[PDB]
Amino acid sequence: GEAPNQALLRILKETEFKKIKVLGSTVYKGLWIPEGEKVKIPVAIKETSPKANKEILDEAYVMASVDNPHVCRLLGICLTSVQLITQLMPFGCLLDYVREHKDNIGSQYLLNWCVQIAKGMNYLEDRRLVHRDLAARNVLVKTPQHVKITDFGLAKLLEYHAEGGKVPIKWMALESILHRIYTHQSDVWSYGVTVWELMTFGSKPYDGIPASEISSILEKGERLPQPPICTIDVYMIMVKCWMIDADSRPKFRELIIEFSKMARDPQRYLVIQGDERMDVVDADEYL
Ligand SMILES: *CCC(=O)Nc1cc(Nc2nccc(-c3cn(CC(F)(F)F)c4ccccc34)n2)c(OC)cc1N(C)CCN(C)C
Numbered sequence: 162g163e164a165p166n167q168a169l170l171r172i173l174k175e176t177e178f179k180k181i182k183v184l185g186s187t188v189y190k191g192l193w194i195p196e197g198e199k200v201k202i203p204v205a206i207k208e209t210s211p212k213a214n215k216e217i218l219d220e221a222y223v224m225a226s227v228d229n230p231h232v233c234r235l236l237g238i239c240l241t242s243v244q245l246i247t248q249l250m251p252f253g254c255l256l257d258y259v260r261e262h263k264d265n266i267g268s269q270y271l272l273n274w275c276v277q278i279a280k281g282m283n284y285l286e287d288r289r290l291v292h293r294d295l296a297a298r299n300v301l302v303k304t305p306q307h308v309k310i311t312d313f314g315l316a317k318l319l320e321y322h323a324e325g326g327k328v329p330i331k332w333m334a335l336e337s338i339l340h341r342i343y344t345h346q347s348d349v350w351s352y353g354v355t356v357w358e359l360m361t362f363g364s365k366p367y368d369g370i371p372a373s374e375i376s377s378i379l380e381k382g383e384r385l386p387q388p389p390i391c392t393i394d395v396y397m398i399m400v401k402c403w404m405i406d407a408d409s410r411p412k413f414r415e416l417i418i419e420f421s422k423m424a425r426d427p428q429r430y431l432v433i434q435g436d437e438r439m440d441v442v443d444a445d446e447y448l
Contacts, residue, residue, distance in 0.1 A: 168226040171237030173246060178206060178239070190249060193236065201441045204236060207245035214243050216314065221245060223313040227288060231281030233301060233311040234444055248444035250301035250309065258302050260363035267439040268390075268431035272424040274300075274308055275356055276417060281310040282352060283413035286345045289319045293343050295351035296332050297358035303445075320344045330372035335405060338376045346407035352416065353402025360388035360395065360431070390433050395423065 179192040184205065193202040207217070224235035224247070236246045252258055255274065259266055278300060285292055292313070299312035315328070323341040334350035336342045354366055366385055367375060384403050387396040398419060404410050411419070423430040433439075 166226055170221065170225050173237040173239050175239050175241050175244075178204070178244075178246070180206060193246060199440045200447060202236070202444055202447055203249035203251070203441065204444070205245075205247045205249045206239075207247065209242065217243050217245060220313050220316075223290070223316045223318070226318075227285070227290070227313075229281055229284040230307075230445075231277045231309050232284060233309045236444060247311075248303075248309075250303050250311075252302035252305065254298050254311075255300040255302055255308055256297035256358060256363055258305075259297070259359055263362040264435075265439050266362065266433075268427035268433050268436050269424070270305060271359055271431055272420055272427050273306070274359060275420040276424055277308050278310065278352065278355065279413050279416040279420060282348060283417060285310070285316075286348075286413055291317045291319060291321050291343050291345060292348050292351070293317060293321070293323075293337075294329060294332070295348055295355055296329065297355050297363070300355070303443075317343065330375050331366045334407065335376070335379045336407060338379075344407060345413070346410050349402050349407075349410045349413065349416075352413070353399045353410075354385065356395075356399055356402075357385050357388065360391050364388075390431050392430050392432065394430050 173193065174196075177194055177196065179194065180189045181192065182190045184190050187208050189206040189208065191204055191206050193204045194200065195202075221235060221238050224233065224245075228234065233250075234248050236248065238245060282292070282295065292310070293315035294312055295310070299310065300308050301311045302308050321343040323343060325341075328337075330338060332351045332354045334347040337347045337350075357366065358364065367378070370378065384400060387393075398411070398416070401409075401411050428436055
């Protein structure tokens, strides 16, 4: 009863990329200039073990099948000696951004980021897609006013039953740690941890506690603390994302509604000191 995935996998010529510089490691900053049409597109290029190909091709499959203003768009792959070509998000991952600009993030930007992440996550749930790695590090920043979800290296297309492997323990639900079960609601848990990272301006969840004890702590009933800038209204939303009963956690469509209400009066829900004074074509316009 599944629908045919008629997504298009675009294959680009290497002679069309101008690897400007290295963004990290390898991921490169560059330009994609399609032959003929006078257009330069700022892109990120993710550059031979047969496992690595099989996995980056799996990620290219997922990114080619999603199309949402809050999900990272795939432009294509290059079959050299395999490269992912994605939209360049010039302000980096949201985790490093809130850490850099701690003294400039207003309650407006925080609550709006929570709305946008829930929108992209709700879209992924519409596509019957479990992310399995939602975190502040995996949310990229196009502009301070526009963020998108990235990194689908663990994404799965539908509960999902994993069989093993390295996984980020402090972001995943209890059911994911004990039974390797992943659902859209286990993504809601990771959403709760991701909101906690933003409200704490990039603090590390369970900083110091070894990952092997996380399963014990959560079973005891202990959760992440209430961030200083958070009213009980916002912290209650995170707490609901951390219920043991997965179906008691809020839906992504509900998290959109809640944070949108808060985004209409941000200073009522986030208390931040000084909150008052805080031919190039982008990929989104090349269709
Ligand atoms: C989280 C860190 C970082 O974001 N650095 C960064 C990123 C970008 N833009 C950008 N656009 C699209 C894709 C990426 C990107 C994706 N990955 C993961 C993987 F698997 F490697 F593809 C990256 C890893 C490392 C770097 C970039 C990756 N990024 C950017 O645009 C100019 C700049 C930067 N920085 C160098 C800033 C460093 N941090 C944010 C302070």
